[PDB]
Write a protein that binds this DNA or RNA. Sequence first.
RNA 1: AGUAGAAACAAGGGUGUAUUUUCCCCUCUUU
RNA 2: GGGGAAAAUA
Lengths: 708, 20, 740, 249
Amino acid sequence: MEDFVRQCFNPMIVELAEKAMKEYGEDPKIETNKFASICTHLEVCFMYSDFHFIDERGESTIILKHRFEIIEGRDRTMAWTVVNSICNTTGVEKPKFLPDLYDYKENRFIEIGVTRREVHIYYLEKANKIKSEKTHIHIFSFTGEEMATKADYTLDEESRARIKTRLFTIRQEMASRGLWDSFRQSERGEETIEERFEITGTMRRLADQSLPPNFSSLENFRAYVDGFEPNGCIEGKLSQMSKEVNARIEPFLRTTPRPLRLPDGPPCSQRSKFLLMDALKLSIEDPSHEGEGIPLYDAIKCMKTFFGWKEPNIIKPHEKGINPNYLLTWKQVLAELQDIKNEEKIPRTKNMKKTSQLKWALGENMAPEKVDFEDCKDVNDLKQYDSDEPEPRSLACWIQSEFNKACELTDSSWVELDEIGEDVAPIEHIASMRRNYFTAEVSHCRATEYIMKGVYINTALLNASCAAMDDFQLIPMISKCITKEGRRKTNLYGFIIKGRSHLRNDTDVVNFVSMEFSLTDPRLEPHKWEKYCVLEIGDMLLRTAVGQVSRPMFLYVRTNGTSKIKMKWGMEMRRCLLQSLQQIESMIEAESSVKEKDLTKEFFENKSETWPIGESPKGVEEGSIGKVCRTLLAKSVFNSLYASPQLEGFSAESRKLLLIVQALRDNLEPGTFDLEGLYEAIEECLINDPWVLLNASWFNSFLTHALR
Amino acid sequence: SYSPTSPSYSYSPTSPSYSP
Amino acid sequence: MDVNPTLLFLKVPVQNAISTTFPYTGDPPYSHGTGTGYTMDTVNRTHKYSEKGKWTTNTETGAPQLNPIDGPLPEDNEPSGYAQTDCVLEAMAFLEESHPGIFENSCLETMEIVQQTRVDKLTQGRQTYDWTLNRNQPAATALANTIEVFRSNGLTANESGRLIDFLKDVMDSMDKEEMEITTHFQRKRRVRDNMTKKMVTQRTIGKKKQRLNKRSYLIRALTLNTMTKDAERGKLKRRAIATPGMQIRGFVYFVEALARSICEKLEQSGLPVGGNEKKAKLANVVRKMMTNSQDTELSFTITGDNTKWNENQNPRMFLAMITYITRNQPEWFRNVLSIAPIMFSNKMARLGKGYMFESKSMKLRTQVPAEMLANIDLKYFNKSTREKIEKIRPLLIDGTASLSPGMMMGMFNMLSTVLGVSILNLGQKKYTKTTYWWDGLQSSDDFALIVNAPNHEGIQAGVDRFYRTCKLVGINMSKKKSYINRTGTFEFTSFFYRYGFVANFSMELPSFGVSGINESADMSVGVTVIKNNMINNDLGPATAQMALQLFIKDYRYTYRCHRGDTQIQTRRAFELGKLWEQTRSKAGLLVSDGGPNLYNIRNLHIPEVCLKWELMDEDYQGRLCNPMNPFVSHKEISMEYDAVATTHSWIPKRNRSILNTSQRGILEDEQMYQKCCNLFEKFFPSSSYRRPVGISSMVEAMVSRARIDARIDFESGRIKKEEFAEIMKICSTIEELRRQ
Amino acid sequence: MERIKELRDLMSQSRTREILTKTTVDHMAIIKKYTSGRQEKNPALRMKWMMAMKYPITADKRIMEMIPERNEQRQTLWSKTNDAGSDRVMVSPLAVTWWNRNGPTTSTVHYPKVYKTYFEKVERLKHGTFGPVHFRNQVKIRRRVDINPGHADLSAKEAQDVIMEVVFPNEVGARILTSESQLTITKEKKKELQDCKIAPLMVAYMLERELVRKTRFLPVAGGTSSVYIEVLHLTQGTCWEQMYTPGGE
RNA sequence: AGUAGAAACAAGGGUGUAUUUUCCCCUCUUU
RNA sequence: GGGGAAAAUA
Ligand SMILES: [Mg+2]
Ligand SMILES: [Mg+2]
C-alpha cells in the first residue's frame, strides 16, 4: 500500500507525510494505513488552503496575503510557535490542541478531518475532544458527505466540489485494488501509538549467549524467571555451602596489635627540593637599593654583603655524579653573576650559557629519540621499559631531627596576611582575636618559612618553565621576612638553574640544578646527602654570643627534578596552614562548648591544658596548644614536601588501624577479620620514603603507648 | 601583643650574623 | 624531645582529630605511562576469580567467554564470582515482597523516561571511545561521528531525535554486512624547525574512507577503551578505568535510570543521595537500629568494603535482575532495558596505548600499539609483563581482550547498589528465622551493617550468614578492609560517625585557591567556597578569616591586582596606581582594581560588585559596568544589547595546538557548525536558553520562521509591502536553492 | 531582512548548504557542542602561569577602536593577533585597568536591575541587628531548607513557565498558564520589561533568580526561613550561637 | 646523572571514564 | 538548558 501512496500523491505531500509520521518513531513500510491517512489529510489541507488569497482591500480572492495559513504538516515545535505567534498577534484564544489551518479573514483556527465512516460520529467525537466553541471543525468523507460548525462552509462551493471529487477518485482507487476494507476497518486504532523494539539478528544471538549455563535461548530464560517463585533456595544453597566459608571475628584485645615491620637496607636520604634545616641564607636589611623586587638584583645585593669567598673544592663528591661538572657549574654561575654586575642595565631574568657542565647536569640529550613503531620494526635489540619496584631503605635518624626543627619557634615573621573588612558582629571580634593568636603562633614557625620557600621556588620555576622553554634560566631562591625588630629583610638561599621545560603531560619533568648555601658539615651524616655534591665555598665569620668564630660555609649542589603537578601543588602550600588551624580551632571549640566560654586565651596564655605531643626518654611529653598547632602545621608542610604514593597508601591503610585502636580504647569490643592482612597492606607502603618511615615509627610508638 | 614562647627554647646556624 | 603528632591521639579521639590523618596538601599519585599493564592485570584477575566457570566461543565475535554462574560454590574465603541465578532471583523476590509495588512503579517511571528522552542526552558524557577513529574524543564529537556514519550507511532512524530511535538505529547497524566509515589518516613530512635547526616529523591529519566487515564493527561496538585513573587518593598502586563507545552508552543510561528509580524507593540504599542527605540517612538508620534494640540485646556495627567489587559483578546477573524487575511489562520495554546487560556480557576491553620499548645499543625508543602485542616476540617484555601477556594471550582479537565476567569499573553502580541493598534487607527477622537480625546501608561497594542478637554468638552467626549470602549472590566482603565493633561508632565512605558525624575539613582543602576562570568569577568562587565550608565542614570563624586572607593574597598575586597604595611593582602596577590616585572613594575599588578587601564573616555571601556598589564613584561605577565594555561578548538584537557584566569578566586566552600537528581540515567542520548554529540562534531567540527540538531541517525551520515573522509583522504593520515582497522572494529562492 | 540575507549567503556555499540541509533541529544540539583539538586541564595552573605573559585575554576587534595600543608609559595594551580569524585580538589586563580608569562613563547601568536579589541581600544585611553570642553545645539537624525563597505563590515549574512566557512569548509551546497568580506575575513582568535593552537570555536568568525556588539539604539549628539560611554561616557554629535579626520584614 | 615508581619523563601528537553530592558561570571558535 | 571546579566510590 506504500507503493500506491508513493505513486499517487504528490512527492511534496508524500515527503511531508513521511516526515510528520516519522517524528513519533513510526516505520513507513509496516504502518501503511496511517501513512495513507496522513497523506490524504495533508492533501486535503493543502487543497483547502491553496488557491485562496486576500487582496489589499481585505476580501477573499481566487486565482499576496494568503487566506489560509497552514499549520498541519509542520513539526510540533514549528507548528506550536506559528500558532503562538498568531494567537499573540490576532488576540484569538489559544487552541488547546494543534489545529490545521488558520483563517485570517475571519481570524479563527480551522480543523480539517478526513474520515471513512459516517460524518456525524466523527464530528461529535472531534467536538467533544477539542471542547471549545472557538475553532471551526470541518469533516470530510470519502462518501461525499461533509459537515461543518453551524453549517458554515466558508470555502466556495467550487472548492468543496473539487475536494469531494478528489476524495471520490481516491476512494474509487482504494476500492479498485481491493484494500478499502482494511483502510476502513483500521481507523479505530490509528490514533494510538504502539512502541516497537524487537531484538533480531545479531543481537538476538548475542542475547542467547548471555544466559546462565543451563539456558539455550533468551525466551526460555524469560519464561523461567517469569514463573520463578522463592522457596528455600537461599537456605538450601547455604546448607550445601561448606562451613569453611565464614567470617570469624577474632577479638582485638590489648595484646593483639603488634609493631609495624619497617624495611631493611641503607638509610633513606634527603629528597626534598631544597634544604630544610641545613639551609643558610645571606640576608640584606631593609632593601632600599636599585631594583627592590627583581630577584636578580636582590641576589646580587645578598651576595655582595658577604666577604670571604674562596676557591671551591670537592669535599663530599656525588658517588654517581661527575663532580667536576658541579664545580664548573658553580664557577659558571659566579662568572655569569659577575658579568651581569659589570653591566649597567641588568635584565629582569638571565639565561645561562649552554655549557658542557650544564648540558650534563640538566640531563640534556639523555632521552632516547622517539620514533613511531611503523619505522622501528627492523630493529632487533628492543627491550621493554624497566618497571622495577623502589629499592627498600631503612629509617634514618635525620628525618626526626628535621621534623623537630620544622616545629621550632622562629624569631622573624614569615607571612604578612592581608587585611579584611571591619568587624561589627561580636562573633567577628571573637574571630579576630582568635585569628590574632593563631597568626602570632603560626607566622613564627619554621614550617611557615618552608611554606614560603617552597611556594616562591615552585612559582618561579613554573613561570620560567612556561615562559622560557629552551633556555637554561637562573633563578635565585629569594624569601622575605620581618625580624623581631619589625624591619623587612631579604634572604637568599642559593640558586636554581632550570633546564629545558618542554612539558606536555602533567607528569613530565623539568631537570634543574640546585645550589644552596649551608653551614652543615656533610661528613657528619653522609648518608643523608647521597644525591648531593657538597663544596666548601667560603669561610663565614659568625657572630657568636661569646664572640666571633670562623666556620666553613659549604654549597650543597645537586640535580633535582619536578613536574607540572608537583609545581602546582607546591604553589598551593599555604593551604597547609588551614589544615592545622582548622583542627586546632575545632579542638578549642570542642572544649569551649564544655565550659560555656571561649578558652582561647586560657589555652594560649596560661598553658593550663596540654596535649601529649612528644616522646622523651623520661616518657610521653605534653605540649601546649601553640606547640600542638606548630606540630600539626609542620606535619602538613612535610606532607606537602614529601608527598608520594607511599604516604597516601600508608595513611589510607593506617586510618583503619587507628580507628580500631580507638574502638578498643572506647571499650566497644572491636573485632577484625584479616588483621594480619591489614598489617601486610600497611607495611607494603613503607619502602624508602623518609617521611612515610617516620610516620610508621610514630605509629609504632603510639601503639606502644596506647595498648597500656 | 602575644609573643609566642616555648619552654623548650648558638648563632642561629640557619640564619647567623656575619656583617663585619 | 621528639615531637610525635600521632601521640596526640592518646588524648583526642581519632575521629575528632581525623582531619590530620588525611595528607591532602600534597600532589596525588599519578600514572606516568600506558595503562595497558593495569588493563591486562584487571582482565587476568577477573578471569582468575571465575576460572572454574564454563568456557565458550561467541558465534559473532569469535572470542572466548567465561560463564561462571551456577558454578561450584566457594570452598574458601578467597574472592569468587560464582553467583547463583536462583539465589539472586530469590533476593529480588524478597526485595519486591518487602517493598510491594516498587518494581512496578520504577518500571512505569523508566518507561516514561524512555518514551520522552532525546538523543542529545548522550552528549552529557565526558571523553568517550570512538570506533570511527578508534580513539577517545568528546561525547558530542563521538555522537556526531556515529550519526554521520549511520546516515552515510542508510540507517537514518535517529533523525526522529528520540534516543530509543537511535538505539533502534544501533540495532540495525549491528546487522549490516559491511560498514563504510570516515577515519583519520596521517601524513608525516620531515621538516627542519627554524628555532632549533633539528629535523622533526610534522604530521597532517585528514579524512579517508574505510570498510569494516561485520566482525570488526561488532568488536568495535562492544569495545570499551581502557585508561589509568589519575589523582586518586589512598592507593599505593594505580588501577584501570573504562570508557564505552556510543553504541553502549544509551542502553547503560536507560539501565542506570531504572536502577536510580529503584534506589530512590529504598531506605537502605546510599544512592542517589549524597553529601548531607547520605549522612542524614546513615544517622537515621543507626539511631533507629539502636532504639529498636532491646536493653538486653547486643548490637554490633560492621564497617565494610567489598574486595574487587567491579570484577565480581556478572552482567548475566544484571540481565536476570532486569528481567525479574520488568515482569508483566511491554516486551519492548523489557528488550530496551535488557540490551545493556546483553552487550556487557559480550564486552571487549581494549588494552590501551600499548607499551614503550627502548634499544640502548641503538639509542632509540618507540611506542608499540596494543594491536602488535599479539604478534611480538615474548622475550622483549620484562618478567611480570611476560606473565601477563602469556596468561591473557587466548583472549586477544584485534587488539582487544574478551571479558564477559565483571562490570568493568563502575558501569552499573546503581544496579550493583540495588543488589547490595537486597542482600542487606534479606536480614529482617522474617527472613533470618532466628533471634539475630541485621540491617544497614550500602552504596556501590561500601556498606555499614548493624547486627543485633541476644549474645555474642548470635552476632557471630549473623555475620557468618550475611557473609555466606553475599558470597552466594557474588559479593565478596574484603576481610582486611572491614572491621566490626560495638554500635555507636563506625565509618562509611570517609564519613566518620562517633555518636554523631564528625567534620572532616581535610577533604575540602583542594577546593580552596583560585579557580582561574576570571577575576570576578574567581573571587566569587573563593568567597562562596569559604562560606560553604564554614556551614558544612566545621570551619571556625578565625580559621575562615585566615582562609579569606590567604585566598585574597593568592588571588592578588595571580591576577597582579595588588593594592594601589603599595610599593610593590609589576606590569600592572602603574595602571592600578594611576587609578588609585584618581579615585576619591578608596573603598569602592574592586580588589581586581587594587581596592581594599572589605570581605569578612558577615558578607561572604554577597558578590563584591554588589558589596562595593554604594561606595563606588559615579564615574568609576559607569566605566566599570559600562554597557559597551569590549571585553565581554555582545548579542545583536547594527545595534547590540547593553552589557551588564563588569569589565573583569573577560575571556582568557585558550590554546589547543598539538605539537607538530595541523588539523585545519578537521577544524573547518567545527567552524561551519558554529556559524550555522549562530545563524539559527539569530533566527530562533530562545535556542540558547532552552535546547530546541524538531525533526525538520535547520534551513526549513528557519525559512518557515522567517515567512511567519514577515506575515505577522505585516499584520501588525511594522513593515510595508516592499519588505514583505523582498523577504518572500528571498525565502522562495532559498527554498528552490535547497530543493535543487 | 539582514538575517534572511545572511541565511541565503550561508546557503550559497556547498559544505554549509549540506550542513544546513542534512542536520535536523535536534542534531543542532550535537553539532553546537562539537569541539576539535586539545582540552586544557587544570584551569588554576593555566591561569597562574599565563597571566605572567603579556597578553592573556582575548577580545573582539572592536576594542581596537577605543583602547589605544599604548598608554602614557608606552606599555602595550593589546597586540595584533596572528592565530585568529581577524575577529579577535590579544589583550592585557593593562587594557582592563585603562578602560576602568579612562574609559567612557555613563550614568545608566543595568547591574542594579539585573542583580536586584543580591542588592536586596545587601540591604537586608546592612539593617540587621546583632545580638550576643552564646557558647553552648550546638545540635545540628540535617534537613532540607530553601536557599532561594523564590515566589510564594509560584512553584518551580510554574515559575519556569512564567519565565518562558514573559521572555519568549512566541515559543512558549503548548504550555498554558493556569493559576491567576501566574497571569498577574506574567503581566507585571511584561509591563516592567517593556523596552528593556538587555538580552532575552539574561532577562530570563534574572527572572529565574527572582522567581524559581531552590532548596538544599543543610545542617541547620534554629531558623529555617530563607532570610536565615543565607546567613547561616554567620549565626550558627559548632559551639557558638549568634543572635541575628535581618533587616527584612 | 636526576625525577620517579610495576612506567614513564629526561622533547618532538599534550593522556583524565560511569554514578552521586556540592559550588561557580552564562557563551569559546583559523598558522 | 548547558559548561567548568571540589569530593566519594567504582
Ligand atoms: Mg571495594
Ligand atoms: Mg569501596
